[PDB]
Design a protein around this nucleic acid. Structure first.
Ligand SMILES: [Zn+2]
Lengths: 89, 102, 356, 179
RNA sequence: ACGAGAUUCCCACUGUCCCUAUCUACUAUCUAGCGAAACCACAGCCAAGGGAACGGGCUUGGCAAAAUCAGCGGGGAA
RNA sequence: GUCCCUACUGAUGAACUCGUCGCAAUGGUAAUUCAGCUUAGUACGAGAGGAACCGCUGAUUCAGAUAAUUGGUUUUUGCGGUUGUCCGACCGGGCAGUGCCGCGAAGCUACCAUCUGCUGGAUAAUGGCUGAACGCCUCUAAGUCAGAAUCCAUGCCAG
RNA sequence: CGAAAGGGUCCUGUAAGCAGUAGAGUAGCCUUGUUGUUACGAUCUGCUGAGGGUAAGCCCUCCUUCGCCUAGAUUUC
């Protein structure tokens, strides 16, 4: 109840900062890089990083068509970015 | 011809088509569409070497058997002179020497 | 099952007989009734529907059509029948001079080893002042017969078939006086009759053919199970059937070089699918595009005849407008209508550069 | 009445071909065949499979920048019907197609630019290491040619002519056993 | 608490079914050679009639055309 | 406490010289129900409500076909991946009564797909015309009109 | 007519081999390396929508190549 239209999006930073990355991947449709109304500097940084390649942006656009290798690649890229950004682990 | 007319329908297409024709003449001008015996004999010899390798492999595959059969040793079997005379001839050896051994 | 088709035996003949020509009155103009063609296969079309009162009105519909290869038939004879208290009786038949080798092949079982002399003495009847004999038979038909039929045979050298033995049949001449139709039949001798003259577009016809055989089959697939009225095992298939009310969607000319083109798509292509009709070949003659499915296997002789009665539906007398005709390969999941369209999509290949 | 493109491979999807999948988010996926449909249900990556346009575009096998391929796009603002406009559009399309293929031909040749240099370099290595497998005439042929040269009165040129003619012109297995 | 104990309920799966379709091997089929047995008064189409609710041979109708191959299960007192 | 003949379903067949094109005695017989649009918010009705003929379009059941398309099936052992063991390694392969997995043409199939199902005469109940019986009267007695998904045929199947 | 072959159409999915320090990793040489070197090196990339199969119940053949042919046996007014 309440999740009509069966569609949900977040920002990429939320996927980076979350404690449960598996929950976001399994329950959302799109990881967006759209600059927030205010303007997120982390989005600007994460967009311009060389780790996020064309394949990474392809998977984030459509989460419901991904497979085993694609999901693992997203988790690996999350860990690499968190190391750059100084997150705990 | 496998295309959608509605996809290409666009006003001012004459200007776009005219611009494309200019690009074609310029590209035909500077040389974007221009097409540019020792090597032939080397390749022919390389094919001959590869063909000989296949024939040698075919000869080896001919005798191999699928699973480890006991075989007659070469020293045990006896061979005709015609086969030895022929094979030596293909290798470029004069016959004059052989003919008196057996 | 149905007891109206009860003697589920193999058809006595491979060709199939009309068994009923439409009732004749002298008021209509002189015309032919039936024709022969060879089943080529099936293809998909898109039709701009114009059915007032239907859900798909003013909309595009995808339909399945069957293609029948129809080389022109050659009229080589004439037959006359008289009315008797015991039914119709053949009084006399008048053959034409100069019959072809194919139609003579029908008269022989071993044509290769035979001294081909069928109708050799009959030819002398025309050319040796025995034309009185030919005219006497023609006058006999005029003054004694009530139904006159035409013997026409196919031309299978044009068909991509290994068979060389043509097919004969009698086609009734309807609509006129007996004298008028006799002069009609004599004038048609030695002449090819094309399919666009017998039938035409957006008219509804009946097709007669022998169904596909299945051999000895049990009750499960023969009579459809979940004495004469009890389901048994026996022959299934190869049964003579007469299917009625099939609408002609197009008649192709073969020489047009744009048979499959419509006023909507401007692609110069013929009806033959990419790679050819599977197990048939290429249709290089006139063809009749019939809606739906029709009894018979591919390359089987097909008998087309007219409707016995004036139609009572709006499916007849309604115009058929075509948008696009499929030509992609039937040998697989085809996606290209023309050889050019495949090369444009995939670019150039390794063999293309090596050859060039 | 439109020609659609496959979601998986991008092949021309014509009417009554393939299958369409409707997702609860409100998106429709069009497939040209069961091969593409079954790969989609198994969650394979079209960008990784080598028989798809997604791989070919992303791997540099196809031209993605050009003036020709920008002419065609999906139009969301209808243009009022005009007979002259449609007729010249068809002529424009025909001109556009032959320019595209005759630009695509250069693209393929540029991709395979250095291929003969590698082939001859490998061929030079093979001959240098396997010189004993080259044609070598025959011992009887050398003798018979030597007498013919002696009778004529250029043995090296005569041998070369014989060597070439036999190379211009297969061995069986076993043979007859006398009964 | 325990039980290859029974029953009910819940989740999951299934050609059990809607409703069937396809595929493989051995048979079934044909040939060469070899080669029985059960059983057998004589036979073998149907209808009505043949008092003893009994017909296979009689009556009087329907009919009725050589010789064969495969399938089946309809018939042969208390 | 007792594998044969026939029937039926199919397939051949000697005699009539072989073949081609036909006729049609006889036998069987096939179509069914519902809905929607228009008529019409009309006739009818105080109101609430609320039809039908002509015309048009679908669907249920049944029947006969067909493979363009979609799905299913795979010994195409067609291509690819992979487990165990082996041919000394590579390449190429064997065996695991088709090792397992993915796709898979062709063929076969599916109201899981698609197509098609047709018109004359005579009647039953009943409603009538002219008109005796019976100086009224009466559809009946002589004569005669219409009329059911009925009957008989055509279309259809066999010959 | 038959057998091959070429082309087309479909199926699969990128062959064997060679090459690029792209390459994680495993080790020697000399002495410190701020850019030291030499070998092996799973994997990746290019040659390569390549390679393989294609009628057995797919399609075509301009001389694409090779071959076969007017039989032999019985019966019939
Ligand atoms: Zn696709």
């Amino acid at each position: 109840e309440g999740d009509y239209t069966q569609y949900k999006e977040t920002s990429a930073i939320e996927f980076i900062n979350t404690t449960d990355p598996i929950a976001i991947l399994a329950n959302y449709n799109k990881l967006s890089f759209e600059q927030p109304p205010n303007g997120d500097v982390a989005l600007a940084a994460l967009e311009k990083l060389p780790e996020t390649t064309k394949e990474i942006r392809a998977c984030c656009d459509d989460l419901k068509v991904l497979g085993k290798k694609d999901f693992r690649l997203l988790l690996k890229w999350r860990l690499r970015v968190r190391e750059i950004f100084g997150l705990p682990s | 011809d496998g295309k959608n007319v509605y996809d290409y329908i666009d006003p001012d297409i004459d200007a776009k088509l005219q611009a494309l024709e200019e690009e074609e003449e310029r590209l035909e001008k500077e040389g974007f569409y221009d097409e540019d015996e020792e090597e032939e004999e080397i390749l022919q010899k390389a094919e001959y070497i590869r063909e000989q390798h296949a024939l040698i492999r075919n000869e080896a595959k001919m005798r191999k058997s699928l699973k480890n059969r006991a075989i007659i040793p070469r020293k045990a079997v006896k061979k005709p002179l015609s086969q030895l005379e022929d094979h030596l001839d293909q290798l470029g050896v004069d016959t004059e020497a052989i003919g008196l051994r057996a | 099952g149905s007891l109206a088709f009860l003697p589920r035996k193999r058809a006595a003949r491979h060709r199939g007989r009309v068994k009923s020509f439409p009732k004749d009155d002298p008021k209509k103009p002189v015309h032919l009734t039936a024709a022969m063609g060879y089943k080529a296969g099936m293809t998909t079309i898109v039709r701009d529907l114009d059915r007032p009162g239907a859900k798909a009105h003013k909309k595009e519909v995808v339909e399945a059509v069957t293609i029948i290869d129809c080389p022109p038939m050659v009229v080589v004879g004439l037959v006359g029948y008289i009315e008797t208290p015991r039914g119709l009786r053949s009084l006399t038949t008048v053959w034409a001079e100069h019959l072809s080798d194919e139609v003579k092949r029908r008269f022989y079982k071993n044509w290769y080893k035979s001294k081909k002399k069928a109708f050799t003495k009959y030819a002398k009847k025309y050319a040796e002042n025995n034309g009185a004999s030919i005219t006497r038979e023609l006058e006999r038909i005029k003054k004694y017969c009530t139904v006159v039929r035409v013997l026409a045979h196919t031309q299978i050298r044009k068909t991509p078939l290994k068979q060389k033995k043509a097919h004969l049949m009698e086609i009734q001449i309807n609509g006129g006086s007996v004298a008028d139709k006799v002069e009609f039949g004599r004038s048609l001798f030695e002449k090819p009759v094309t399919i666009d003259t017998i039938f035409e577009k957006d008219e509804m016809i009946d097709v007669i053919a022998v169904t596909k055989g299945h051999g000895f089959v049990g009750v499960t697939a023969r009579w459809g199970t979940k004495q004469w009225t009890v389901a048994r095992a026996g022959q299934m298939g190869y049964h003579h059937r007469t299917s009625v009310n099939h609408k002609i969607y197009r008649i192709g000319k073969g020489d047009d070089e744009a048979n499959a083109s419509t006023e909507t798509d401007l692609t110069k292509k013929k009806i033959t699918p990419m790679g050819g009709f599977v197990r048939y070949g290429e249709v290089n003659n006139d063809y009749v595009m019939i809606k739906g499915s029709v009894p018979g296997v591919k390359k089987r002789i097909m008998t087309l005849r007219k409707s016995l009665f004036t139609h009572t539906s709006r499916k007849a007398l309604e115009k058929v407008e075509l948008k696009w005709i499929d030509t992609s390969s039937e040998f697989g999941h085809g996606a290209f209508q023309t050889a050019a369209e495949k090369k444009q999509f995939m670019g150039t290949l390794k063999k293309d550069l090596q050859t060039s | 009445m439109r020609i659609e493109n496959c979601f998986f491979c991008g092949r021309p999807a014509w009417p009554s071909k393939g299958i369409t999948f409707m997702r609860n988010d409100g998106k429709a996926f069009r497939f040209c065949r069961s091969k593409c449909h079954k790969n989609f249900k198994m969650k394979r990556n079209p960008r990784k499979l080598k028989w798809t346009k997604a791989y070919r575009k992303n791997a540099g096998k196809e031209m993605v920048v050009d003036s020709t391929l920008q002419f065609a796009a999906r139009r969301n603002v209808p243009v009022r019907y005009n007979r002259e406009l449609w007729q010249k559009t068809l002529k424009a399309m025909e001109r556009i197609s032959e320019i595209r293929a005759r630009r695509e031909r250069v693209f393929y040749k540029k991709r395979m630019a250095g291929k003969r240099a590698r082939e001859v370099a490998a061929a030079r290595k093979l001959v240098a290491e396997n010189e004993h497998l080259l044609p070598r005439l025959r011992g009887s042929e050398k003798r018979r040619l030597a007498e013919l040269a002696a009778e004529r009165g250029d043995v090296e040129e005569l041998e070369r002519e014989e060597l070439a003619k036999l190379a211009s012109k297969s061995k069986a297995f076993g043979g007859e056993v006398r009964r």
